[PDB]
Amino acid sequence: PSIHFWSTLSP
Amino acid sequence: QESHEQCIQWIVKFIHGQHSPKRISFLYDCLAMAVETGLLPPRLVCESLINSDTLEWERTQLWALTFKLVRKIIGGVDYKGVRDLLKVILEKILTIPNTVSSAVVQQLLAAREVIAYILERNACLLPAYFAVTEIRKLYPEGKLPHWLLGNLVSDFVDTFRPTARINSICGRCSLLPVVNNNSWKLDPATLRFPLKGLLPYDKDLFEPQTALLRYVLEQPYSRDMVCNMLGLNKQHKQRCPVLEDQLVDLVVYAMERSESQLLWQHLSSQLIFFVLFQFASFPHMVLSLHQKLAGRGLIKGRDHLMWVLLQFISGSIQKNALADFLPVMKLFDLLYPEKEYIPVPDINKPQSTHAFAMTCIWIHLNRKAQNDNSKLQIPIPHSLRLHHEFLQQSLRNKSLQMNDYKIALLCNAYSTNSECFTLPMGALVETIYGASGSITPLPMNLLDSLTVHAKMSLIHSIATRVIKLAHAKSSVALAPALVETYSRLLVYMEIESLGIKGFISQLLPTVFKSHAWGILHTLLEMFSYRMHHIQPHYRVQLLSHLHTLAAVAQTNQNQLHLCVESTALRLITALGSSEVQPQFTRFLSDPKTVLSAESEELNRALILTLARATHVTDFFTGSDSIQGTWCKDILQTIMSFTPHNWASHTLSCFPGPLQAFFKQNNVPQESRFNLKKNVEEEYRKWKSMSNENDIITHFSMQGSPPLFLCLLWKMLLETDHINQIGYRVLERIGARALVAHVRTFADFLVYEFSTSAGGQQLNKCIEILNDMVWKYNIVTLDRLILCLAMRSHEGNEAQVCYFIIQLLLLKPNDFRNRVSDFVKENSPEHWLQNDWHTKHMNYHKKYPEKLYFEGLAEQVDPPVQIQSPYLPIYFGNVCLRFLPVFDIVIHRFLELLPVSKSLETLLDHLGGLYKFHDRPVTYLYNTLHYYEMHLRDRAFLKRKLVHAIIGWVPDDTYYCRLIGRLVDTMAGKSPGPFPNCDWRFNEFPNPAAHALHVTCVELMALAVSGKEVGNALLNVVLKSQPLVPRENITAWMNAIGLIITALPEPYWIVLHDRIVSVISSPSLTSETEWVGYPFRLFDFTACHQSYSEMSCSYTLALAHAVWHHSSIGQLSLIPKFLTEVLLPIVKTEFQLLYVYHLVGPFLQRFQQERTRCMIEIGVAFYDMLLNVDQCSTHLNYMDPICDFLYHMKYMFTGDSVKEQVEKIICNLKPALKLRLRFITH
């Protein structure tokens, strides 16, 4: 569950 | 033939092989006479003698003989060849060393002789523009020429400054734009203005525009503008060092000035964006910042700088390598030399988060070092021990509240870690997670204290919970605190990947696919009533989603249909003037995506938005056709799925192409006689039936004319009740299909009211209509009023329709009571409140909202029970839904003249509802700009429109203060002409935009003519006054140009009269001779300018500023002005030069946008030259005039105009004909 700048709501 | 050149070269080297000087000279003389009689082509012989490989400055005698020969035989070469010979001669002479014995120097002056001959203007072998461009290409600016030539080249370049001054704008480096989310493009290599041609421009134009770039970067939402300015395309890792340096200097400037929170958030956001989009390297910026800050001295902004660094370190530490973030430790060593112990700041202030930035940075670095362990460990800094102990103790305590910033500090410090982050997150999110019982959202100040990583974690949790609840198909409504917190969190633009892009692209489609209809309704309401700053493409994308949602998915429910209609109307009406064309040009292929199939009201609103945007932006000035434009297909596809006609009064205000389009495509209208006959026949048939299913089927059949609302009116007009069958028919027809019935009921109402008596017959009818709206809940008030106001009646019928609207709004108490209560117990600053939900329940409990015909169901002889569950409502009500309808009603009331008195009463009674308007200032600006001709006589109607929505001849001090306010706003003052405003929630991103729009509204609201307003605005500078300091006159002109360009046409047309007055002045009309070019006549930065040349120079500079800030549609009047006004009054050289200075710099724009105007300008210039030549006895500035004309032909016009200029050139005097002989070719 890493949340960075290059993440998106779609798993 | 082919071997002639080889044979000539062989003969040349055979001659050069001799050693006897006399024999060589004799051979050269024999070749000279052979050449002069025509035995050899001059191009071939000169090229051979000059490109011979044996030529070298060691062979002094051979060099001198060859150059005297080429001087003797150079006179018979075409000018292209001459230019090439000039180039090769300079290339050859460049190789001469600086130190040469004087015994041969006089022998190497033959090259100076030939260059002197070729650069003589009288002989005119080639145009001087070729010579100057070749010389400048070989020797760029600042390079000292070869010592042999020296003064010759220096002065020959020096004779082109008048042309370089003609092709330059006055005070260009001190003109700044207004940033709104072109003419300001810059070179991405050296921040230079792109200059056309190789001419000796001024020194200031060769320096980088650091001031302009810094001013642009200091403004919020300047990311797209700066990318467009620097020409950066999101396609590769460009890594602009100039952009990195500018960002670093901006950070240094901010820290030096630190000796607010929004400002630092803006910088952090800018660094985030530019590092993310591969335009900067974070370690490189850190190292450059370290070098710049080394040995600076006092540094008090260290906490803010480390907070800015943490905003990126926390976000990017998850994947980026640990080596990138290493130099932060060296930066900390530089900016924190104390080595004792830092006291723990009070945790009761927002600054506590900033004071802990370095401790948080070290914690993140230590955690990253703990992952992928070994290699190198990061030890604890000695000073930051108390802070670490405080954080550890706060984490150890298991009972911590939200009174202080302990939650924020723990979230910032331990965001990266997983185990240590559960406790602060739970403590922060349980209160909003808990319809749920949570009503208090997260405070805005607390949200600002968090870091970007914490904000992303919060939004990811909220979005995941929303998706899970939607997939669970549970009927539980979302937490009001959750919805409010989501709306607040969706403001930050550094989280675009999860904030709004993920909200529109993924969350909404997922909720759509999950068939929730409750989550979708809440999200749509949240967007409508809480989102302030949304990028236009996101808005248009959501508009397309709304249209397809309304069209499909069987959303045949009153509430959902109403929400979609209201949301779509608000987005359509809220579009910006400068955004419509770029946003709708992307959907040129498939307009149906952004259009609608059944909402005639939405299509007409889009058309009205199109008209006002094109009027304000002056898109159609200089054109009389719609074909070839982007509006044609949109209008045609609107005519499909929605044929309609526009009233005469509402169509007379449209632009010319729109009016021409709507004169054709006329749609026949149903006659009132046939409408009345149909209504009477339907009523007699309704009363003649006794069954039940037959009536329901007959009166609910699709395709039958929509007359059932008329039937309801006819029934309860005479019998004053509605049977159960009427309710059954209304339930069966459906909300989506009732719109046509409302539309026809509007026309029937207008006809019936027009064909009626007065007194009781109207009081009864208006009471009936009010009862239908409120008591029976048949149709909602805003829908009814919108359908009334979107009609196509004429004259008396239009007056009746607007009278009906006014009576329905004001005669009963139902709407007035609701407006008064909402205004009295509510406030618009929604981000600073905690009890909005309690206020919302209070209002809704006092005034329930009915959407499923509850009143009509109740008022049946057997009562009918309604069992349709309601979707949750969180933000909206009828008062907030009515605002766009009220804007449109204002526009119609302005359009129709006899009903102007009713608008004053409407404003006086319902003007308090604009306190909740999104963009009241922008609305008034558009309204006053659009209806200037209509309101220019009704001065009292203004100051009433302005006072209701926002709230004597003035002297020169008023205008001076008005200009100075914007001047200081752009300059940047700590107090500021306006108080600090939250750009994240206000309509205006910048104080500059806010001041500009307020000033324009205030100027247009005055009861004086546009000519007087414009003349006073120019006179602020053009006539000497106090409190107008010098050395800042360029920015005063910049502010005046901005304001006058934003003002309508009758306000900026006075520049032409001012220019003509300057032309006809004795300064330019006098025949007194001058020594040299009249530089001070056209230069505003002169020592002492008396009065007349001061007026001329200041008028030139003001015209340059106005035309630099003007749009292309406004520039389209310059060619007609030049051909019709200035052409028959120019008779002297000074006037010709003045006009060249006026219009010269702006030819590049015409070339990029409009070519026919450029051609007309060129022809007008040539005719003016002919007139001046004919009138004057002799020309003293032939060289500057010809240089400018050659530059024009060779850079902008090309060979486009030849037939229109041959006749003009052939009639000139022989001297000008000799100079301008190459223009024909």
User: What is the sign, positive or negative, of the torsion defined by CA atoms of B383, B387, B392, B396?
Assistant: positive
Q: Output the six-digit token pair for B336.
A: 């924190």
Closest by Cβ to A3, choosing from B457, B467, B507: B457
Distances (CA, A) of B1128 to B3, B504, B1177, B1186: 59, 60, 18, 21
A6 and B315 within 8 Å at the Cβ level: the answer is no
Segment 1-11 of chain A within 8 Å of chain B by CB: 1-10
- Closest chain B residue by Cα to residue A10: B506
Cβ neighbours for B777, distance < 8 A, ≥ 6 positions apart: B850, B851, B852, B853, B854, B855, B856
- Asked if B315 has any chain A CB less than 8 Å from its own CB, the reply is yes
Cβ neighbours for B1201, distance < 8 A, ≥ 6 positions apart: B1159, B1162, B1163
Q: Output the six-digit token pair for B908.
A: 């006086």
B497 and A6 within 8 Å at the Cβ level: the answer is yes
User: What is the sign, positive or negative, of the torsion defined by CA atoms of B1045, B1047, B1053, B1056?
Assistant: negative
Q: Is B321 helix (H, G, I), strand (E, B) or coil?
A: coil
Experiment used for this model: cryo-EM
Residue B1005 CA to residue B1008 CA, distance in Å, equals: 9
Residue B237 CA to residue B247 CA, distance in Å, equals: 17
- Asked if B460 has any chain A CB less than 8 Å from its own CB, the reply is yes
- Asked if B59 has any chain A CB less than 8 Å from its own CB, the reply is no
Residue B1161 CA to residue B1139 CA, distance in Å, equals: 11
Q: What residues of A are in contact with residue B468 (Cβ under 8 Å)?
A: none
B352 contacts B343 by C-beta, under 8 angstroms:
no
Q: What residues of B are in contact with residue A6 (Cβ under 8 Å)?
A: 319, 497
B426 contacts B419 by C-beta, under 8 angstroms:
no
Q: Output the six-digit token pair for B57.
A: 């400055």
**Would you report the helix, strand and coil content of chain A in percent, each value rounded to 5?**
0, 0, 100
Residue B410 CA to residue B183 CA, distance in Å, equals: 48
Mind giving me the DSSP string for B991-1028? HHHHHHHHHHHHHHTSSS-HHHHHHHHHHHHHS--TT-
- Asked if B410 has any chain A CB less than 8 Å from its own CB, the reply is no
Q: What residues of B are in contact with residue A1 (Cβ under 8 Å)?
A: 418
Our CA dihedral for B783, B786, B790, B791, rounded to 10 degrees, sits at 70
What is the CB neighbour count within 10 angstroms for residue B762? 16
Distances (CA, A) of B392 to B360, B380, B409, B446: 12, 14, 11, 21
Residue B145 CA to residue B561 CA, distance in Å, equals: 78
Our CA dihedral for B977, B980, B983, B984, rounded to 10 degrees, sits at -170
- Of the candidates B684, B674, B743, B675, the one whose C-alpha atom is nearest the C-alpha of residue B709 is B743
Distances (CA, A) of B1048 to B271, B691, B892, B1060: 39, 65, 21, 21
Residue B306 CA to residue B264 CA, distance in Å, equals: 11
- Residue of B310, B318, B464 for testing the chain A interface, max A β-carbons within 10 Å: B318
Residue B653 CA to residue B257 CA, distance in Å, equals: 51
* Secondary structure string (H, E, C) spanning B340-374: CCCCCCCCCCCHHHHHCHHHHHHHHHHHHHHCCCC
How far is CA B186 from its chain centroid? 17
Distances (CA, A) of B131 to B82, B152, B1135, B1186: 9, 12, 28, 14
- Of the candidates B1181, B1132, B1225, B1075, the one whose C-alpha atom is nearest the C-alpha of residue B121 is B1181
Residue B343 CA to residue B836 CA, distance in Å, equals: 40
Q: Supply the DSSP symbol for B171.
A: T
B220 contacts B180 by C-beta, under 8 angstroms:
no
How far is CA B362 from its chain centroid? 41
Q: Resolution, rounded to a tenth of an Å?
A: 3.0
Q: Output the six-digit token pair for B1029.
A: 């300091």
Q: Which residue has the tokens 């324009």?
A: B1000
Q: Which residue has the tokens 């994240």?
A: B984
Q: Output the six-digit token pair for B1007.
A: 């009861």
Q: What residues of B are in contact with residue A2 (Cβ under 8 Å)?
A: 318-319
A5 and B460 within 8 Å at the Cβ level: the answer is no
- Of the candidates B1082, B1131, B1081, the one whose C-alpha atom is nearest the C-alpha of residue B1104 is B1082
Residue B111 CA to residue B57 CA, distance in Å, equals: 11
- Asked if B499 has any chain A CB less than 8 Å from its own CB, the reply is no
* DSSP count for chain B of H helices, then E strands: 68, 0
B462 contacts B447 by C-beta, under 8 angstroms:
no
> What count of Cα atoms within 13 Å lies in the side-chain half-sphere of residue B448?
18
B497 and A5 within 8 Å at the Cβ level: the answer is yes
Residue B744 CA to residue B1186 CA, distance in Å, equals: 70
For B847-918, where are the alpha helices, taking DSSP H only?
854-858, 878-881, 883-895, 900-910
B1058 contacts B1104 by C-beta, under 8 angstroms:
no
Q: Is B975 helix (H, G, I), strand (E, B) or coil?
A: coil
Q: What residues of A are in contact with residue B463 (Cβ under 8 Å)?
A: 9
Residue B193 CA to residue B196 CA, distance in Å, equals: 10
B498 and A10 within 8 Å at the Cβ level: the answer is no
Residue B551 CA to residue B654 CA, distance in Å, equals: 30
For B586-734, where are the alpha helices, taking DSSP H only?
600-617, 631-639, 648-651, 656-663, 672-686, 693-700, 708-718, 724-733
B163 contacts B1145 by C-beta, under 8 angstroms:
no
- Asked if B497 has any chain A CB less than 8 Å from its own CB, the reply is yes
A2 and B507 within 8 Å at the Cβ level: the answer is no
Q: Supply the DSSP symbol for B651.
A: H
Q: Output the six-digit token pair for B174.
A: 């001190």
Residue B789 CA to residue B885 CA, distance in Å, equals: 8
How far is CA B793 from its chain centroid? 37
**What is the phi-psi region of residue B278: left when phi exceeds 0, alpha when psi lies from -120 to 50, beta otherwise?**
left
- Closest chain B residue by Cα to residue A11: B464
B319 and A4 within 8 Å at the Cβ level: the answer is yes
Q: What residues of A are in contact with residue B498 (Cβ under 8 Å)?
A: 7-9
B1132 contacts B1175 by C-beta, under 8 angstroms:
yes
Cβ neighbours for B1023, distance < 8 A, ≥ 6 positions apart: none
> What count of Cα atoms within 13 Å lies in the side-chain half-sphere of residue B518?
18
Closest by Cβ to B318, choosing from A4, A9, A10: A4
Q: What residues of A are in contact with residue B311 (Cβ under 8 Å)?
A: none
CA angle at residue B408 from B403 to B412, to 5 degrees? 170
What is the CB neighbour count within 10 angstroms for residue B38? 9
Residue A1 CA to residue B422 CA, distance in Å, equals: 13
Mind giving me the DSSP string for B1075-1142? SS--HHHH-SS-S--TTHHHHHHHHHHHHHHHHHHS-HHHHTHHHHHIIIIIGGG--SHHHHHHHHHH
Distances (CA, A) of B448 to B407, B408, B497, B1062: 13, 10, 19, 56
B499 to chain A, closest Cα gap in Å: 9
Residue A6 CA to residue B909 CA, distance in Å, equals: 52
Beta carbon pairs, A and B, within 8 Å: 38
User: For chain A, what is the radius of gyration of the CA atoms?
Assistant: 6
A9 and B318 within 8 Å at the Cβ level: the answer is no
Closest by Cβ to A9, choosing from B272, B418, B506: B506
How far is CA B742 from its chain centroid? 39
Q: Output the six-digit token pair for B416.
A: 């990266």
Closest by Cβ to A3, choosing from B456, B502, B506: B456
Residue B330 CA to residue B552 CA, distance in Å, equals: 60
Q: How many residues does chain A have?
A: 11
Q: Output the six-digit token pair for B1120.
A: 């007609």
Residue B795 CA to residue B790 CA, distance in Å, equals: 15
What is the CB neighbour count within 10 angstroms for residue B711? 20
B74 contacts B46 by C-beta, under 8 angstroms:
yes
- Closest chain A residue by Cα to residue B317: A4
Segment 255-274 of chain B within 8 Å of chain A by CB: 272
CA angle at residue B772 from B769 to B775, to 5 degrees? 125
- Of the candidates B1206, B1045, B1125, the one whose C-alpha atom is nearest the C-alpha of residue B1142 is B1125
B506 and A4 within 8 Å at the Cβ level: the answer is no
- Asked if B468 has any chain A CB less than 8 Å from its own CB, the reply is no
Mind giving me the DSSP string for B396-418? H-S---SSSTHHHHHHHHTSS-S
- Residue of B319, B367, B452, B504 for testing the chain A interface, max A β-carbons within 10 Å: B319
A10 and B506 within 8 Å at the Cβ level: the answer is yes
- Of the candidates B216, B287, B299, the one whose C-alpha atom is nearest the C-alpha of residue B257 is B299
Mind giving me the DSSP string for B1160-1211? HHHHHHHHHHHHHHHHSS--S-HHHHHHHHHHHIIIIITTS-SHHHHHHHHT
B722 contacts B862 by C-beta, under 8 angstroms:
no
B790 to chain A, closest Cα gap in Å: 42
B316 and A5 within 8 Å at the Cβ level: the answer is yes
User: For chain B, what is the radius of gyration of the CA atoms?
Assistant: 38
Query: Dmax over Cα atoms in chain B, in whole Å?
Result: 135
Distances (CA, A) of B342 to B329, B356, B359, B363, B1076: 17, 10, 11, 16, 70
B542 contacts B527 by C-beta, under 8 angstroms:
yes
B735-754 and B708-718 helices, crossing angle to 10°: 50
B463 and A9 within 8 Å at the Cβ level: the answer is yes
End-to-end Cα spacing for chain B: 28
Which string of b and e fits B851-861 if b means at least 16 CB within 10 Å?
bbbbebbbebe
A4 to chain B, closest Cα gap in Å: 5
Q: Output the six-digit token pair for B559.
A: 């509430």
Distances (CA, A) of B949 to B419, B912, B946: 53, 8, 5
Residue B258 CA to residue B245 CA, distance in Å, equals: 20
Q: Output the six-digit token pair for B29.
A: 């003389």
A9 and B276 within 8 Å at the Cβ level: the answer is no
- Of the candidates B1047, B835, B803, the one whose C-alpha atom is nearest the C-alpha of residue B906 is B803
**What is the phi-psi region of residue B628: left when phi exceeds 0, alpha when psi lies from -120 to 50, beta otherwise?**
left
- Of the candidates B476, B507, B468, the one whose C-alpha atom is nearest the C-alpha of residue B490 is B507
Our CA dihedral for B626, B630, B632, B634, rounded to 10 degrees, sits at -150
